[PDB]
Amino acid sequence: DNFVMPRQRAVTVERERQAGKQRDAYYVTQRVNLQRYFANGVVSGTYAA
Amino acid sequence: DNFVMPRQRAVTVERERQAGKQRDAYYVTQRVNLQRYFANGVVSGTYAA
């Protein structure tokens, strides 16, 4: 419950014909981060040094 | 009366969505000069040196 994925855009595929290279260029962008509402909330385990 | 602004194009705006870079570019271009029909006609006053 402490973690939220702040969004803002979702996978946007944008294709631009880039003639002159006779190519079609597809670009996909997304802006997402994991965040945590409050500092606490995860414990990780580690193999021992 | 001696000066005319020779035109040829006036301020126009062209938006060119450039996907693949995800920008939208506004290129505004214009073409004009200030020219005098005959050389006479301007006196400028100058601060002294």
Within 8 A by CB and 6+ apart from A49, the residues are: none
Q: How far apart are CA B22 and CA A12, in angstroms?
A: 10
Beta carbons within 10 angstroms of residue B31's beta carbon: 10
Pairing type for strands B3-4 and B35-36 reads antiparallel
A30 touches chain B (CB under 8 A): no
B16, B21, B23, B24: best mutation site toward chain A, by most A Cβ within 10 Å?
B21
Experimental method: cryo-EM
State the Cα–Cα distance between residues B47 and A4, nearest whole angstrom.
67
Residue A48 half-sphere exposure toward CB, CA atoms < 13 A: 0
Token representation of residue A20: 């002159």
B18 pairs with which residues across the strands? B23
DSSP three-state, residue B10: strand
Query: How far separated are the first and last CA of chain B, in Å rounded?
Result: 32
- Spell out the residues 6+ positions from residue B18 whose beta carbon is closer than 8 angstroms to its own: A16, B24, B25
**Chain A interface includes B6 (CB < 8 A):** no
Please provide the size of chain A in residues. 49
Judge whether A27 is closer than 8 Å to chain B, CB to CB.
Answer: yes
Report CB contact under 8 Å: B20, A29. Answer: no
Data resolution in angstroms: 3.4
Taking the C-alpha atoms of residue A43 and residue A2, their distance in angstroms, rounded to an integer, is: 13
Q: Do A29 and B22 touch (CB under 8 A)?
A: yes
Residues comprising chain B, all counted: 49
For tokens 């214009």, name the residue. B30
Token output for B28:
């505004």
Chain centroid offset of residue B47 CA = 28
Q: What is the dihedral sign for C-alpha A35, A36, A40, A41? A: negative
